[PDB]
Structure 1
Amino acid sequence: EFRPEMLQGKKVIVTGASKGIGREMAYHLAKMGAHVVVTARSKETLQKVVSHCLELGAASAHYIAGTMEDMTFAEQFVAQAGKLMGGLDMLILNHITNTSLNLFHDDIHHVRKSMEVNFLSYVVLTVAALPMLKQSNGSIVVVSSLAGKVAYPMVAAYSASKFALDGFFSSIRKEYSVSRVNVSITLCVLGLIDTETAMKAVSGIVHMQAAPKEECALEIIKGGALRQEEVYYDSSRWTTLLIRNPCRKILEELYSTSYNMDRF
């Protein structure tokens, strides 16, 4: 059972926080009394978000502008964010490289860039954040999509990158469990969200109900606060019925009896 008080005084990083869901998450955390450090490329927009967050009641609020294409930036941002706040309780990984619906033909640069930004940078951020999260017994929140669980035409690269996050973060979650790293990892599986970016990209191609981003932002925060492994958020009740893979959980359990990890 979530209570907003759970975020009060928590030190939180939100990436891709200048717009959409990331910005909504910043605002919610602001209202909850959390310390926040938001990031994205747009310094000016970040400034506005930061100002509004202080308005909303954030215990403290800062932004650091940069591109997540740059792994050195990602790494230094975490350290700098942690220094401003005196630690870190939750790492919210939410940015993605800009993407539109298109048939895949030969754009290898977009497939590479998508892997770099949507996947690689999440890993670099995690490595950089880990000692602080370990010290706080904090949380990693990874923003994924229904397209990171099942296949859709027109987003091959993006979907590849969301699939990767599941495979990467679900692996380390089992490693953490065994090495006693008390850091939660919540994978967020979102359907269509009414963000300006998504609504434009799907215009005339996709005819489905877009869920509200303010609510989506909250359900993400909630999942992290409760240390849930996965969060499922979609308009359709049929998604919520079919989305889970209980067989996958069973299989992982059955295989767990066939390997020995005492040796690190």
Structure 2
Amino acid sequence: QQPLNEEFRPEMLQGKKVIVTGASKGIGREMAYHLAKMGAHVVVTARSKETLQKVVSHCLELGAASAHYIAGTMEDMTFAEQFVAQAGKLMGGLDMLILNHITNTSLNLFHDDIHHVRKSMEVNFLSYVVLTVAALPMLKQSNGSIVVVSSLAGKVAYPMVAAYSASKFALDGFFSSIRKEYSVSRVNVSITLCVLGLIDTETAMKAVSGIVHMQAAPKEECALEIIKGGALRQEEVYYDSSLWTTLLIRNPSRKILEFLYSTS
């Protein structure tokens, strides 16, 4: 899509109607806090109602125009579809959909855990598609934005996270193809793919402990950079400690291959 040739300003999110998934902790929670500070209307989701309630409490205090939570599992495609319709009724519409949740994952060699591969695909990928289908009519009304939280493991291969990597690679293939479809069918809904390096979330620090030794970037800045990129309608956001990653990760050969086919 066409990005906004503008600098980011917090006023851009004031009164905006935002959904944040997997917002009970880590990056999702930090995104909900930044959005609350900007005076946005926020609807947060995850499975734990107790942690989600704590997130909403802080959001209301930070100055959100409104803040609500709806608890449930993204393993359940009916909840996924119903969540969006409910989130839209609470805010009276939708401007931005931030898809960020993932199924529980640990660092382990792949052996025979087909059920983890399937669950990663359903939760990390399939539910995102279901949420997008549910949200698209409201997003078309507001010329909104879809923000997809991915990973460096969704752009390059990593040992010990095969199922996870597969699900993140699937997000790129699906959302990048539909971005091209939206360009041709003149659908004014932006799609931002966020390619993240290791972030200092509670889950990440526990998961890589004693296995991986590398710099973890701050979650607060990470969340803000995701919100900025989505607000500016950027196609991709890259955020990592090294940079290095930042400038090596871009793929101009892919861009030429995609442009040269945007003529056949």
TM-score tier by shorter-chain length is over 0.9
Partner Cα distance (1:50, 1:239) in 2 = 34
Runs of 4+ in 1 over 6 A off after TM superposition: none
State how 1:78-227 maps to structure 2 within 5 Å: 78-227=84-233
Alpha-carbon distance, 1:148 to partner: 0.1
Alpha-carbon distance, 1:207 to partner: 0.8
Partner Cα distance (2:87, 2:262) in 1 = 37
Residue 256 of structure 1 aligns to a residue whose secondary structure is: coil
Partner Cα distance (2:215, 2:22) in 1 = 23
Alpha-carbon distance, 1:256 to partner: 1.2
Alpha-carbon distance, 1:241 to partner: 2.0
Deviations 1:93-144 (A, max 9, x none): 0000000000000000000000000000000000000000000000000000
Deviations 1:149-202 (A, max 9, x none): 000100000000000000000000000011111000000000000001000110
Q: Which residue of 2 aligns with 1:261?
A: none
Partner Cα distance (1:205, 1:238) in 2 = 22
Residue 251 of structure 1 aligns to a residue whose secondary structure is: helix
Alpha-carbon distance, 1:236 to partner: 0.6
Query: CA RMSD, aligned part only?
Result: 0.4
- Does 2:251 match 1:245? yes
Q: TM-score, normalised by structure 1?
A: 0.97
Partner Cα distance (1:22, 1:196) in 2 = 12
Alpha-carbon distance, 1:255 to partner: 1.1
Unaligned runs of 5+ in 1: 259-264
Alpha-carbon distance, 1:237 to partner: 1.5
Partner Cα distance (1:226, 1:111) in 2 = 34
Q: Which residue of 2 aligns with 1:262?
A: none
Deviations 1:19-74 (A, max 9, x none): 00000000000000000000000001111110110000000000000000000000
Residue 181 of structure 1 aligns to a residue whose secondary structure is: coil
- Larger RCO (alpha carbons 8 Å, 6+ apart): 2
Partner Cα distance (2:263, 2:74) in 1 = 39
Residue 189 of structure 1 aligns to a residue whose secondary structure is: strand
Equivalenced residue count is 258
Partner Cα distance (2:259, 2:182) in 1 = 16
Q: TM-score, normalised by structure 2?
A: 0.97
Partner Cα distance (2:231, 2:21) in 1 = 17
